[PDB]
Amino acid sequence: AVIKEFMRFKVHMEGSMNGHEFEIEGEGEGRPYEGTQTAKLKVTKGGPLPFSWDILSPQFSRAFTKHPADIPDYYKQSFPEGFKWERVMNFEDGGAVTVTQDTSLEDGTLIYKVKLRGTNFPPDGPVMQKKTMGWEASTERLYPEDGVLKGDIKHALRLKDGGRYLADFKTTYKAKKPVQMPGAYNVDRKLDITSHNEDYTVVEQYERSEGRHSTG
Numbered sequence: 001a002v003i004k005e006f007m008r009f010k011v012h013m014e015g016s017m018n019g020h021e022f023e024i025e026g027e028g029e030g031r032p033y034e035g036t037q038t039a040k041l042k043v044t045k046g047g048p049l050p051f052s053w054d055i056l057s058p059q060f061s062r063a064f065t066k067h068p069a070d071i072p073d074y075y076k077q078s079f080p081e082g083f084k085w086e087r088v089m090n091f092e093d094g095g096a097v098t099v100t101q102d103t104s105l106e107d108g109t110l111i112y113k114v115k116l117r118g119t120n121f122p123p124d125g126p127v128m129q130k131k132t133m134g135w136e137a138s139t140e141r142l143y144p145e146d147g148v149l150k151g152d153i154k155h156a157l158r159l160k161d162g163g164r165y166l167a168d169f170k171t172t173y174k175a176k177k178p179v180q181m182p183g184a185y186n187v188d189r190k191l192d193i194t195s196h197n198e199d200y201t202v203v204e205q206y207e208r209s210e211g212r213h214s215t216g
Helices: none
Strands: 007-017 020-031 036-045 083-091 096-106 109-119 132-135 138-145 148-159 164-175 185-196 202-212
Touching: 007 036, 132 185, 138 164
Parallel strands: 007 109
Antiparallel strands: 007 020, 020 036, 036 202, 083 096, 083 164, 096 109, 132 148, 138 148, 138 185, 148 164, 185 202
């Protein structure tokens, strides 16, 4: 009930990549039951970022997934209190990122707080040289356990020279109160950087997310 057909959110991120500290502030909006959302992010410290924006784009919104009638929505049910998540991203060349997030609701506006720590990226690799070109469309496989959801994604970044740069995401999503738990299911996503200024200190992105059953 508390999640309306149109919702806004604000996000703050603090992080470091290979020891380089930075912060991001942003705002977004979307249609939580249609599974669509947009956001505009601004670098507020440590810019211009000496690494690909693609590392950060997936950390900016789980209340905005479309679900079929028979898969209960773990994220929407957790409100007004909300939920947390913790994520590990691991890349084929050894880069590793840990991300924690808190999602809360203040006066009808979603509030996101993100912390990120990335390490072991080769200083001449595609992430630190800003040679990626966004995330390909992905599927996250989720399953329930002790009142939380655990997700895994086998994922690929596009490379400027034409290749693919592989990554694995493992995330645990935890509601701040008990909710009715779904079965295992999948979420299909596509996230796009839709505009950016010259040095990627202002960036806009768009995501479409839809849940479905797995057939096996």
